[model samples]
Target: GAMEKRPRTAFSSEQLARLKREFNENRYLTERRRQQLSSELGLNEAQIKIWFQNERAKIKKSGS
Candidate 1:
């Protein structure tokens, strides 16, 4: 497949809230948990991975 623009995701309020709650509980995601969220949120594994990655960056960006 050729590389193309990655479209931005518009997460619903419920989805965003759930992701945040999970992040607060576990900043890092294990394979088990990632799979769990993947199924529960109907989001791709990469989506969850990047969300956590961006979140950790935000935490550090704030000097956490």
Candidate 2:
């Protein structure tokens, strides 16, 4: 099997703003909320998932 390389997704400042705002409201995302954010933010679920995962790890690492 050949390995596939995917391009990294870089979010715009506006998108990051919205993502952070939502993250501040709730770190956990329900399926419905995920779909809603996906549609509203024009991002795929996988990207959204990764963003949240990375953001959470960053917050934990920072020891807020």
| lDDT scores in order | 0.81, 0.80
What's the distance in Å from true for residue 35, model 1?
0.9
Where is model 2 more than 4 Å wrong at Cα?
Answer: 1-9, 61-64
Q: Model 1, stretches more than 4 Å misplaced?
A: 1-9, 61-64
Q: Which ten contiguous residues of candidate 2 have the minimum total lDDT?
A: 1-10
Which candidate number has the best TM-score?
2
Model 2 CA lDDT for position 3:
53
Q: How many backbone clashes does candidate 1 have?
A: 0
User: Deviation in angstroms for 31 in model 2?
Assistant: 1.1
* lDDT of candidate 1 over 6-53, digit per residue (tens): 745557888998888888787888887889989987999988888888
